[PDB]
Point group: C3
Chain length 438, copies 3
């Protein structure tokens, strides 16, 4: 086996196809860095990265290659870093073997046993923090026979980011672990920032070309409903596996997962890669462009065209004139009818459509001496819950009704509804009577 | 090519199978509307829609058809509207070409190049708002050879809705973008409202029939774990693609995605379509019915039967009697043992099971002169974090320990635990000593 | 048909392969229990379960078997319980037919028509609560020809849990429905607790063995990005269906869904099953171990090895020294430039890059007499929204601009930017002028 140096490429670029009918020893040299970068216009963030970029450098090897993996951590790094590649068969995917303090180096070796497109990421405590700061990338293990040649290959990885400040707030934004743990992202992006791959930084192709996208999802947390606006995937390698799906509009990419999608571009214009959990795209930044140049094909698409729609919208909260006014019951008939709504929405699942309950389990509200003898017991049952021995129409019950957080109006109305149905005692209970039971 | 008028159907109905062995020019006329509708009993919402319904009218064409797409916006609309169909190969899926102010019309043309079941939706700023208000539907592009005939075809699309008020609050509810951006839905529904397709509005079939469901997910945000209670999918077209999976209980439908599922119904009764992220179904409204009529088959299923379970439950918070009481350490042995728990749960990932750390990266807590000489430094390290040059047992460290938001009791206990292990100095630190370090 | 007793196994164990070339009548006896168990060290929780464990007992049958299902509810249970098995063709998956009050029993019969690995769970109101308390398990319906023999079979089910207290808080923790409805989990676990299947409770195998995992996701709410650290799935049965995917790093398991994954273990060490929405694994508890014993294979993996990484981290919030300082504009040129950022991030999607808008829909900001004549109208448009008839450069508009929740500084800056572009009137608006418009 001859040794070769891996050619690593920054996103959105991909190394050339392997030019070997046989195995080699591949030497990889990757460094870990911590540095400030732009996350959106006017907003900065300390990105942690494999090789200077988020996602990290793309690695391309052949199934069966013997890999020497060298990780070096810059001395300016404050944290140790390591690597788990999903392409590795071995403990921690390399994590135990690549633990690298600032200024130091580690080396491990592995054979690439499985072809596919694999996420790699840092595996240093706090793991979610390292990953959330941008420490992820892709390694392609080509099948022995190689992949079909295509005209354009691009590398993108989606990530969710969590900042102390809100989206768009100017300044150097720190990581917010409270948001990250809650899975509540401020930014969702391809390739490390809002607008990383739009306008002059767009992916490019020409009419008639085949395009392949190597799409990863570094997470840490979110699952991508991955879609290209104005295109349909001719082929999807399902979850990056061997299975090929065709004619797919939108595919799910797991957190810590990847997929390969392919399509021929037949019409010129801008095609927009998004996470179709759609506020992530137009509000949080999960929007990249593929700009296709060449002659119109009016047999495929013809219409007015102007790049004045599908622009980024930001994350400010937009509101229309509010239409809501509180409604309260004014008389007994109205309490009964409002109460029926409360009953059917909240009580019926147990006590049933005609108040009959389920014998031995949920007692009847229909002709209930328990309720009729003191309607405030029905009020208390809702507010406080009801458990333990009770008697309803001389039948013993011993179940548990949960407390339910209904307001005074709803309780007053539902109890009034029940009292005026199913041969119960009639009368009514008011919201103020309920308030005083609290 | 002869021209034909597309027959558009409201949910849950589907147009008839294409009756052509060849291509046609298909003319579609679709209008956009804004109008109040019911979202749950007593609750109203301003739905924005393609053709009057949420989801919009179903469109059925054949692969290779030349489509003339006409969109008209009613003059009562306050907003412009447009359309992106996932079936279109072309910029914006038609969005740039169909931008239609109230009272106006737009026309574009496209060829349906890819067979499948495709989401369409509005693409007008604010995009998430337009989609969240109900502007989505499905277009079926039949394969040239057509689909197998089945006895029943139904159209459903799941959507997540975001209201200023809580679930079930009577009144005209406005859209809440703050909730939408956070992906925190008040309602999750099929076909535009809670109970849209239950009881008298159920889907129907007869024992022995084959049923096909065209199921979309308009989002905007949520991914559906789509399941039919009491049934198993005989076939799933994976993510709406060419790939067929069989014997699937539950399938993921991406936001802005779709799938076709098929099953033969062999037993009578009510079968319940749900999103199996299960609070969405029984609490938030993602519950539709397929009622199957015909003779029992006791060789397949026999049991007591009564439609008194799996009823809608509403979204009120139910609580059982609370069992929780705060626990604090009463003596040194107890502080040590409680501290061991805090240590193993929060500190060990770096400082290791026996306090040895990782040389050069995480300093030892075992026989730590740094801690033993002033235990309050350990307290401060947790409260404030610790970074920069330190010395531990004459070894230099320069790492960064994050601040960790542990309370006074937990800090006091973990520091006491460490002091009483690994040949450290003993003694203890109290919660009040920790409080005063803050 | 001979009758046989189902052998039910507790997690992570699986019953032996069916030893029959033909159908049988299989009798299942399962009980429902409510009891306190550990959820994490020092933390207890009342688990509700089928047979004593979370997940419940594993059931293994053959396609075509006639099943008699007996459910018995212990008299110490406070709640009724029932069962919906996804393997059943019939109403409620058995739910209507198995409703069992404490001290009681129910029986129903069904034929297992579809092979696969199926979730079962409780279906008693409140359904989400019963499921969230641990009431789920798996039933395997073997295909008639059986599954390939493997060396190790293990049973795991992921669940999300919701407690009143925060992760790790000592005591008996009650279920928190408010968190559950919001899908905001405190714990995410395999097999019912943090550390259920780590250390001495790890899964085990030997180098060279084939391992099959029957992996379910009981939810109630979350979807698992299921991954085994240091391994690649040789085969995945997609969503538990007939379709086989190969060489998959991470697969999505739907809530109320399952999958079978297989891999040969070729290197010794600890391999870590996780949900790769990665904070769930290292912080919330979704971390199980498979420990593989045997000789090293240095041709596959060679590196330093020490089980000092990928340790559980707990859910305390960790923070690095905060780098953020608020920035405000000091002069007109700076207001203009800061305003350009606000403009491009929040306004451009409608009013366009050069302020031209879209004729008839979004009015121009370029040379806008409306704004130039009273810049405070631009301020008000943002704060309050703007709707109804207006006139811009003698052109009538009647659209609706949403209110947008921008702060005083951002509004002052964006209006100043607009005034100083596109032949507008110049001048400026200050943050204090904006404040007073509120
Ligand atoms: C706001 C909606 C509800 C109303 C108005 C309501 C009403 C009542 C009333 C008046 C009683 C006293 C006994 C009787 O008259 O039969 C009762 C008890 C009971 N309810 Fe409800 N209920 C509601 C919700 C629910 C729900 C959703 C469940 C099922 C999770 C439930 C289960 C029970 C049980 C088990 C008891 C007996 C408790 C014992 O034996 O101590 N209830 N309810
Ligand atoms: C509440 C749990 C923790 C306790 C009780 C604890 C304790 C301490 C103590 C007493 C020191 C001072 C030096 C020494 O005595 O060795 C220290 C420093 C340090 N710890 Fe922790 N620690 C905890 C959590 C963590 C975690 C989770 C990490 C890894 C993310 C970490 C990483 C470090 C580092 C890097 C230093 C050295 C800082 C410098 O060089 O300025 N610690 N810790
Ligand atoms: C903070 C960002 C924004 C600024 C500075 C801004 C500015 C203005 C101004 C000054 C006007 C008054 C008319 C004119 O001068 O042309 C106006 C009106 C209008 N804007 Fe905006 N705008 C912003 C955001 C948006 C967005 C995002 C939309 C689209 C969802 C929008 C849609 C409209 C419409 C429809 C009107 C006319 C309202 C009517 O006819 O009553 N604006 N805007
Ligand atoms: O002794 C730990 C110390 O050595 C370094 C290299 O200088 O890392 C070595 O030890 C790690 C943990 O065992 C290995 O994963 C790694 O391969 C090896 O180089 C420093 O990074 C570390 O602080
Ligand atoms: O001039 C914009 C104005 O014209 C209308 C039709 O009255 O829309 C036209 O312009 C749109 C944007 O370029 C096209 O997408 C559309 O096809 C075309 O009819 C109005 O809708 C719009 O306000
Ligand atoms: O009468 C309801 C009462 O009977 C029990 C058995 O004691 O359950 C029976 O009724 C259920 C509801 O119809 C059936 O699903 C079940 O098969 C049947 O045994 C009790 O559980 C219930 O409280
Ligand atoms: Cu790192
Ligand atoms: Cu990983
Ligand atoms: Cu619209
Ligand atoms: Cu779309
Ligand atoms: Cu139960
Ligand atoms: Cu289920």
């Amino acid at each position: 086996l001859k040794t070769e140096q891996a050619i690593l490429t920054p996103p959105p670029m991909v190394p050339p196809a392997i030019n070997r009918d046989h195995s080699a020893k591949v030497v990889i040299n990757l460094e870990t860095r911590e540095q400030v970068g732009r996350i959106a216009d006017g907003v900065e963030y300390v990105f942690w990265s494999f090789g200077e970029t988020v996602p990290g450098s793309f690695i391309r090897v052949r199934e069966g290659d013997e890999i020497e993996f060298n990780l070096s951590n810059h001395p300016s790094s404050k944290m140790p870093h390591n690597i788990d590649l999903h392409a590795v068969t071995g403990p921690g995917g390399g994590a135990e073997s690549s633990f690298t303090a600032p200024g130091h180096t580690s080396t491990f070796n592995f054979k690439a046993l499985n072809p596919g497109l694999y996420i790699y990421h840092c595996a240093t405590a706090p793991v979610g923090m390292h990953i959330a700061n941008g420490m992820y990338g892709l390694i392609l293990v080509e099948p022995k026979e190689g992949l079909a040649p295509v005209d354009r290959e691009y590398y993108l990885v989606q990530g969710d980011f969590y900042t102390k400040g809100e989206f768009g707030e100017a300044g150097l934004q720190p990581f917010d672990m409270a948001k990250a743990i809650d899975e509540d992202a401020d930014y969702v992006v391809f390739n490390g920032s809002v607008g990383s791959t739009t306008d002059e930084n767009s992916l490019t192709a020409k009419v008639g070309e085949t395009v392949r996208l190597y799409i990863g999802n570094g997470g840490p947390n979110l699952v991508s409903s991955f879609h290209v606006i104005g295109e349909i995937f001719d082929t999807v390698y399902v979850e990056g596996g061997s299975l090929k799906n065709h004619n797919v509009q939108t595919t799910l990419i797991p957190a810590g997962g990847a997929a390969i999608v392919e399509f021929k571009v037949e019409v010129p214009g801008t095609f927009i890669l998004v996470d179709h959990s759609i506020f992530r795209a137009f509000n949080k930044g999960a929007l990249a462009m593929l700009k296709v140049e060449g002659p119109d094909d009016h047999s495929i698409f013809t219409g007015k065209t102007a790049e004045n729609v599908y622009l980024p919208e930001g994350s400010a909260i937009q509101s229309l004139d509010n239409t809501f006014t509180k409604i309260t019951a004014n008389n007994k008939d109205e309490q009964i009818r409002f109460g029926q709504r409360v009953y059917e929405a909240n009580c019926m699942a147990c006590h049933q459509a005609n108040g009959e309950g389920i014998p031995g389990a949920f007692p009847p509200l229909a002709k209930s001496d328990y309720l009729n003898n003191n309607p405030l017991l029905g009020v208390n049952a809702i507010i406080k819950g009801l458990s333990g021995p009770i008697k309803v129409n001389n039948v013993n019950y011993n179940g548990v009704m949960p407390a339910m957080n209904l307001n005074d109006e709803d309780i007053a109305n539902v109890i009034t509804f029940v009292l005026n149905n199913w041969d119960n005692a009639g009368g009514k209970v008011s919201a103020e009577q309920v308030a005083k039971q609290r």
